[PDB]
């Protein structure tokens, strides 16, 4: 089986979290946690939180051995965008997209 | 630089206020029109 965690609504662009996700996809839980704890990217704190939640789900709700677990699948999806107005010169306005993202992690043997 | 709106309460209430509207027949028509549209603000 595959155990899931979801981190819907992280205040960050999915394009940014995707670089973090690409490096932990398919790795063992230990190696992936190392990569996430020593990354300098903001998206790594979100990916690490979601991965830790998925590991705890697999250990508590399903009684799996987290020693044989691995990041079976991970992907980031776009969340809801907050729309803000940015004033510019000469009385002109721009729209600002404050993008959010959904992180889905599934761990399994 | 100096802009178009320079607020003054006395000047606002004396050019646009309720008693200024009620002093004229045309101001009372302004009020009748605002009441017919149902505006929550009759006068400044």
């Amino acid at each position: 089986m595959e155990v899931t965690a979801k981190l819907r609504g992280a205040a960050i662009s999915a394009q940014k979290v995707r670089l973090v996700a690409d490096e932990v996809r398919g790795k063992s839980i230990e190696r992936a946690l190392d990569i996430l704890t020593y990354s300098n990217k903001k998206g790594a704190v979100f990916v690490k939180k979601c991965l830790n939640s998925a590991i705890a789900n697999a250990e508590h709700n399903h009684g799996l051995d987290i020693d044989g677990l691995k990041v079976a699948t991970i992907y980031v999806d776009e969340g809801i965008t907050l729309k803000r107005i940015l004033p510019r010169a000469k009385g002109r306005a721009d729209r600002i997209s404050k993008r959010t993202c959904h992180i889905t992690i599934k761990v399994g043997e | 630089m100096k802009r178009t709106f320079q607020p003054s309460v006395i000047k606002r209430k004396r050019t646009h206020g309720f008693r200024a509207r009620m002093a004229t027949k045309k101001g009372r028509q302004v009020l009748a029109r605002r009441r017919a549209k149902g505006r929550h603000r009759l006068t400044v």
């Binding site: 973090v20 490096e23 190392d34 990569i35 300098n40 | -």
Partner: protein, 53 residues
């Protein structure tokens, strides 16, 4: 000064074929046994068998 056509998603992603997160080198501290960034002290102050606090 601006594009004459929108870029295709294929070319947009070929330009991102060089984007990559940096992965830190890690080691095990001889005294504590703990993982740390290479050439960096551990989170608790140990580097190369030497305390700092």
């Amino acid at each position: 000064a601006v594009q004459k056509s929108r870029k295709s998603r294929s070319r947009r992603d070929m330009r991102r074929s060089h984007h990559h997160m940096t992965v830190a080198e890690l080691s095990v501290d001889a005294t504590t046994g703990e993982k740390h960034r290479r050439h960096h002290m551990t989170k608790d102050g140990f580097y190369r068998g030497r305390q700092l606090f």
